[PDB]
Amino acid sequence: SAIPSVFETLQGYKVPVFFSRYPAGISIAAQEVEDALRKIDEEASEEGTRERRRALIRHTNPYGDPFTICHCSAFPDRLALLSCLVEVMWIHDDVTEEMDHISACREHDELAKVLQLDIDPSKFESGNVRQKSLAVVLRKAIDIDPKQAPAMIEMLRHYLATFDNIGGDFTRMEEYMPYRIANCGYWMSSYFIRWGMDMTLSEEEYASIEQFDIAMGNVLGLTNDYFSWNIEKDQETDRMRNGVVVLMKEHHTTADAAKMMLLGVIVEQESLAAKLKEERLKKPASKEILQYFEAIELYVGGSCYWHSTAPRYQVFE
Amino acid sequence: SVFETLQGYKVPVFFSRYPAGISIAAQEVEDALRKIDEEASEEGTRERRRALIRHTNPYGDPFTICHCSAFPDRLALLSCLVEVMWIHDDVTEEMDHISACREHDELAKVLQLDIDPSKFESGNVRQKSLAVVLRKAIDIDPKQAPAMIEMLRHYLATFDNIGGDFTRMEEYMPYRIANCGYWMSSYFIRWGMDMTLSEEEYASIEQFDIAMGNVLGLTNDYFSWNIEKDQETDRMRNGVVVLMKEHHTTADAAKMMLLGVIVEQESLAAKLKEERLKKPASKEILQYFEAIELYVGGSCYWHSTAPRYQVFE
Numbered sequence: 001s002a003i004p005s006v007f008e009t010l011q012g013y014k015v016p017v018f019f020s021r022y023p024a025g026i027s028i029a030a031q032e033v034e035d036a037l038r039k040i041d042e043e044a045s046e047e048g049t050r051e052r053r054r055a056l057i058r059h060t061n062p063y064g065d066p067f068t069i070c071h072c073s074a075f076p077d078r079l080a081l082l083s084c085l086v087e088v089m090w091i092h093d094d095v096t097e098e099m100d101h102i103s104a105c106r107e108h109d110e111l112a113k114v115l116q117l118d119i120d121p122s123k124f125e126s127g128n129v130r131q132k133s134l135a136v137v138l139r140k141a142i143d144i145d146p147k148q149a150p151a152m153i154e155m156l157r158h159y160l161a162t163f164d165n166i167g168g169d170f171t172r173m174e175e176y177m178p179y180r181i182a183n184c185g186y187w188m189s190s191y192f193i194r195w196g197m198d199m200t201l202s203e204e205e206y207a208s209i210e211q212f213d214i215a216m217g218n219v220l221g222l223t224n225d226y227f228s229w230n231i232e233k234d235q236e237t238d239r240m241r242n243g244v245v246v247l248m249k250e251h252h253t254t255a256d257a258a259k260m261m262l263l264g265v266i267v268e269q270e271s272l273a274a275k276l277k278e279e280r281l282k283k284p285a286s287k288e289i290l291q292y293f294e295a296i297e298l299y300v301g302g303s304c305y306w307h308s309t310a311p312r313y314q315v316f317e
Numbered sequence: 318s319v320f321e322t323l324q325g326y327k328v329p330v331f332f333s334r335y336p337a338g339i340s341i342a343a344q345e346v347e348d349a350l351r352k353i354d355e356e357a358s359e360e361g362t363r364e365r366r367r368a369l370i371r372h373t374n375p376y377g378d379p380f381t382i383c384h385c386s387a388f389p390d391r392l393a394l395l396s397c398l399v400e401v402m403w404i405h406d407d408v409t410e411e412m413d414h415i416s417a418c419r420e421h422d423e424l425a426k427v428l429q430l431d432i433d434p435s436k437f438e439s440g441n442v443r444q445k446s447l448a449v450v451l452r453k454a455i456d457i458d459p460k461q462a463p464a465m466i467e468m469l470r471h472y473l474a475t476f477d478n479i480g481g482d483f484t485r486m487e488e489y490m491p492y493r494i495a496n497c498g499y500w501m502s503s504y505f506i507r508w509g510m511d512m513t514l515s516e517e518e519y520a521s522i523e524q525f526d527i528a529m530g531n532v533l534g535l536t537n538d539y540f541s542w543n544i545e546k547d548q549e550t551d552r553m554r555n556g557v558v559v560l561m562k563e564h565h566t567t568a569d570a571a572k573m574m575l576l577g578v579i580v581e582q583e584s585l586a587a588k589l590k591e592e593r594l595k596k597p598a599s600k601e602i603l604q605y606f607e608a609i610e611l612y613v614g615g616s617c618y619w620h621s622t623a624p625r626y627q628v629f630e
């Protein structure tokens with residue numbers, strides 16, 4: 001293995017609905033990260049709100065926490081920070097998916113104002129609770145790695161500007177799929193996979209695995225679609241984001257037939273990623289390339305594993 | 318301990334959750350298979366060439382992988398027996414249905430507990446070869462030979478006796494389990510391990526077994542669609558076309574749907590096994606679980622790379 005020994009492997013085969021070819025693990029610092037997440041949940045969502053109730057269900061963990069599983073490759077000190085930072089983004093998602101698109105985009109621009117290299121969390125005392133919590137965690141994530149902080153801030157601003165900026169329905173997979181990689185947060189998550197390992201890829205290194213990265217991004221968000229369809233199908237939204245409804249429209253099929261199609265699409269993207277990795281590895285590969293491969297496979301395989309059994313996608317209104 | 322475990326994750330198109338192995342007796346079995354291919358098919362025929370292509374094996378032989386759990390003496394017997402059935406399939410698929418059924422009936426005349434192979438030297442080369450190996454297979458296990466013959470007669474009577482097109486999966490899937498030979502192959506998974514299941518033991522895992530049978534034949538459909546879609550037949554058997562007709566989609570969409578159906582059947586089977594294992598389970602039940610998973614996993618592994626299914630340009 002090319003990444004530090006910070007995780008224990010999970011036996012996915014013991015879970016009947018876990019279908020991924022990729023491995024799953026769980027961080028050795030799981031308890032400590034769960035504590036940080038429950039604390040930030042208290043502060044970044046208000047009592048009595050829907051987003052507070054969803055945050056609690058999201059960290060009801062019969063098989064493990066989503067972050068300690070999916071980001072198990074991260075150094076423990078970094079894992080607590082990136083988990084709480086993405087957790088604030090996930091609370092924001094639950095808040096803004098329920099808003100009309102225009103109001104939602106204002107809220108994204110509001111939260112984006114926290115994204116400063118010189119962020120002072122006190123200057124957001126009269127803001128909403130997500131601004132307050134994000135500024136505090138972001139402050140720490142800058143201070144832990146100031147060399148990477150500009151890139152992280154650029155990544156976070158690009159996310160809030162683009163992940164939810166299209167309002168329509170989609171009618172073809174070939175247009176939905178590129179957008180859903182952004183919408184599902186993969187460019188943020190995969191950034192933090194590298195950041196949590198205190199490593200980067202060069203421009204040339206990234207370009208050499210970019211098609212692989214896109215296939216994995218496809219697997220990650222479409223697998224969430226597959227598992228979150230039941231809870232999403234009756235959600236009241238002006239912009240459903242789920243491959244099942246896209247395929248229903250593109251091919252004029254029932255929900256059930258479209259969900260079978262989606263699962264096949266996912267499995268073929270897992271195979272495409274595996275082919276693309278095989279081709280890359282016919283040329284010499286740096287240690288950094290090898291550890292991105294290993295960690296992103298644990299991210300995608302762990303995500304499948306956690307989604308398979310997460311109360312979030314089964315316990316709803 | 319008659320097999321080595323394969324690393325399926327190294328094959329990008331291998332998607333099954335189930336394991337794959339290969340027999341320690343692979344070379345012996347392949348020699349016997351090449352031997353029977355010369356005897357049970359005629360030089361320069363279509364079916365001879367398809368049999369040679371079937372055993373080109375960059376990753377291993379169909380039989381040494383899927384039936385890797387069998388004692389090596391039985392493996393060479395059941396592999397050559399099924400192989401004659403496979404040649405027979407290649408021959409009869411391309412015949413009109415009535416002619417095919419007559420050929421199935423002619424072949425079944427060999428299936429008797431007291432077969433005398435010399436009684437068939439004037440018959441066609443598949444009757445000849447099947448009688449020879451059937452004799453040996455009866456004799457290696459006379460106690461099991463009645464059930465074996467019953468199963469083989471049931472197979473030739475029901476695997477290809479429907480002639481129409483299928484327009485719903487609800488009907489296609491139970492028929493495809495038989496049409497793909499799964500009741501023959503799964504019997505030889507038990508026979509090859511010199512064991513059996515009692516009627517109640519089988520009753521307790523029957524839904525599991527149906528789910529695995531669905532996986533097996535539908536996985537073949539997925540990987541063999543590319544060649545079968547242009548084959549001249551009056552009775553195509555492939556879930557892709559069934560789904561195209563039932564849901565009115567393109568072939569590409571139906572193939573995606575079929576892959577999804579397969580993976581959900583693999584999950585269903587794992588759910589059913591987990592349920593069964595909440596009650597006490599005999600050694601035999603545990604043996605079948607482990608060997609049938611190697612069969613289904615190995616079959617996905619072999620199909621995913623077999624030259625048999627390749628199409629070019």
Ligand SMILES: CC[N+](CC)(CC)Cc1ccccc1
Pocket residue numbers: 086089090091093183184185186188189220221224303
């Ligand atoms: C990091 C992405 N997200 C988006 C809801 C948190 C903001 C959760 C998620 C993870 C994996 C797949 C889909 C969504």
Ligand SMILES: CC[N+](CC)(CC)Cc1ccccc1
Pocket residue numbers: 399402403406496497498499501502533534537616
């Ligand atoms: C064992 C069944 N068969 C039928 C062509 C030999 C008679 C090969 C086969 C194996 C698995 C799936 C489909 C076909």
Ligand SMILES: [Mg+2]
Pocket residue numbers: 093097183
């Ligand atoms: Mg969302």
Ligand SMILES: [Mg+2]
Pocket residue numbers: 093094097
């Ligand atoms: Mg959501």
Ligand SMILES: [Mg+2]
Pocket residue numbers: 224225228229232
């Ligand atoms: Mg979702």
Ligand SMILES: [Mg+2]
Pocket residue numbers: 406410496
């Ligand atoms: Mg056939």
Ligand SMILES: [Mg+2]
Pocket residue numbers: 406407410
């Ligand atoms: Mg055939």
Ligand SMILES: [Mg+2]
Pocket residue numbers: 537538541542545
């Ligand atoms: Mg076929």
